[PDB]
């Protein structure tokens, strides 16, 4: 054990777990999931007295881990067991493909108006308990290269056309679960090469949500240190979940 020294003491014996997940999505214009995965890692900040034997239980088998490396200190068998380094370390990393919660449903609607205008409506639906708030929601609607200007209306958030980037960027500070927001935009088209079909790229999203999209949920983290005279009941334990978009594209 060259990852933890031997004489370690704390009045307040406390640990913190961060479940950090990136959820990736490619949805067809109809609503098929073409492809979707989650990449996750658990980080553990530990301030525990001695050299303790901890047992990390999640809800495996309940969700389905495709595969997952671990950290040195993990003894493989069959639940997860270790003597943690002190302070902060990555306990595990993992991937998931099955039974993924997709926190956001993006519903695009596009209408051509002769050769002068594109009419676009986009609806976002949040798909999770009303009690929880997504934050840092960024919707990105791409615009053709022949774009003279853009009008947008939206009741929630602020949106501005970014011509440098050829996209409308709609930002919402926070949104509750089980809700709907929409944006309307009118895109004014310069005339163009006549035989140029717009390769309509995907509408894409950014968000942070306070839960694991994988479905992963921490059930216990048990601390046993048999020398010293603090039991498990004495340890103060915290989780937080931070699920963030990776690639989260919906085809229009």
């Amino acid at each position: 054990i060259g990852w933890r020294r031997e004489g370690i003491k704390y009045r307040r014996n406390e640990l913190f777990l961060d479940v950090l997940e990136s959820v990736n999505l490619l949805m067809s214009p109809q609503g098929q999931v073409l492809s979707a995965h989650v990449s996750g890692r658990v980080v553990m900040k530990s301030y525990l007295s001695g050299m303790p034997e901890c047992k990390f239980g999640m809800n495996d088998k309940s969700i389905a881990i495709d595969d997952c490396t671990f950290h040195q200190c993990v003894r493989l068998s069959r639940s997860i067991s270790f003597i943690p380094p002190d302070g902060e370390f990555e306990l595990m990393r993992y991937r998931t493909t099955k039974d993924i919660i997709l926190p956001f449903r993006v519903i695009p609607l596009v209408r051509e108006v002769g050769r002068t205008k594109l009419e676009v409506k986009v609806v976002i639906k949040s798909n999770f308990k009303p009690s929880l708030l997504a934050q840092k929601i960024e919707v990105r609607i791409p615009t053709p290269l022949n774009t003279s200007g853009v009008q947008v209306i939206c009741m929630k958030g602020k949106a501005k056309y970014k011509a440098s980037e050829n996209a409308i960027v709609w930002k919402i500070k926070r949104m509750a679960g089980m809700k709907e927001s929409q944006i309307s935009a009118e895109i004014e088209l310069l005339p163009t090469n006549d035989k140029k079909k717009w390769a309509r790229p995907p509408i894409s999203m950014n968000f942070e949500v306070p839960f694991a999209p994988s479905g992963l949920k921490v059930r216990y983290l048990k601390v046993f240190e048999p020398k010293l005279n603090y039991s498990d009941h004495d340890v103060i334990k915290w989780v937080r979940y931070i699920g963030r978009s990776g690639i989260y594209e919906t085809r229009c």
């Binding site: 913190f16 306070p210 921490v218 059930r219 216990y220 983290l221 334990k237 915290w238 989780v239 937080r240």
Partner: peptide
């Protein structure tokens, strides 16, 4: 405004 909750 939150960050960090007890399990269950």
């Amino acid at each position: 405004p939150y960050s960090y909750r007890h399990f269950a």
